[PDB]
Design a protein around this ligand. Structure first.
Ligand code: 93R
Lengths: 229, 11
């Protein structure tokens, strides 16, 4: 079934994907803290910061990634940022959701001072990943695949990045044939979602303009990773 | 240069 080295690499990616969590302090606030546009928003900012924290730490561990040129490491990180976050978010919302929590989070998201035109496609996409009751390793691999696009802007050496993404794609494909042997389109169904995930790069870039009214000045990490002002 | 991200990637 799975090559000896492919498994050597899949273990390596799991040992980084499963290392990281959303903190107690943060998931409590979803229950604990008071409700309103100000506090609900203020919570979402903390989560988003947490995802960048987690994104980064995942990224640095991806095998090969340290050999990449420093500028290209940055480019990748900022390019993949928004997609990685929508993807972590979904799977925080679909799997690590004591059901009461995820309902309260839905309420809080829908009264965050953010508008439907953004909220609705987010929840759409969640539900869409919902079907394909994705597994632990499916998310870790996609995330690594999303992070290592040769497609992103400002990369010098696309060839080096392509050669890092391709082993991973193989592993995934060979993974679909093992946990979904009855359904041979599965691997495609996945990258189909990976396409509607890139839709969100426009949503995000727009959404910064809309909400930048009322002057937040997000925490330093979101400031730097989203590249605002 | 992005000091914050270099900082986090090299930690
Ligand atoms: C949700 C997973 O992705 C994000 O974490 C995220 C992204 C990629 N972009 C933005 C602009 C935000 C945000 O909080 O808007 C000011 C947050 C954000 C936080 C909560 C809810 C929503 Cl719709 C967004 Cl876009």
């Amino acid at each position: 079934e799975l090559t000896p080295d492919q498994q050597t690499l899949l273990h390596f990616i799991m040992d980084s994907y499963n290392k990281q969590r959303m903190p107690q302090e943060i998931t409590n606030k979803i229950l604990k803290e008071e409700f309103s546009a100000e506090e609900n928003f203020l919570i979402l900012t903390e989560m988003a910061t947490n995802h960048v924290q987690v994104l980064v730490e995942f990224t640095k561990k991806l095998p090969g990634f340290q050999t990449l040129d420093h500028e290209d490491q940055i480019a990748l990180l900022k390019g993949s940022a928004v997609e990685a976050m929508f993807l972590r978010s979904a799977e925080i919302f679909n799997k690590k959701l004591p059901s009461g929590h995820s309902d309260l989070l839905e309420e809080r998201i829908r009264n965050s001072g953010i508008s439907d035109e953004y909220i609705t496609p987010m929840f759409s996409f969640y539900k869409s990943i919902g079907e394909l009751k994705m597994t632990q390793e499916e998310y870790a691999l996609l995330t690594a695949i999303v992070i290592l696009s040769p497609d992103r802007q400002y990369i010098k050496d696309r060839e080096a990045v392509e050669k890092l993404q391709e082993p991973l794609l193989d592993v995934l494909q060979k993974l679909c044939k093992i946990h979904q042997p009855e359904n041979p389109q599965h691997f495609a169904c996945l990258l189909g979602r990976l396409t509607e995930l890139r839709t969100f790069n426009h949503h995000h870039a727009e959404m910064l303009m809309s909400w930048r009214v009322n002057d937040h000045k997000f925490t330093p990490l979101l400031c730097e990773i989203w590249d605002v002002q | 240069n992005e000091a914050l991200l270099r900082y986090l990637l090299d930690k």
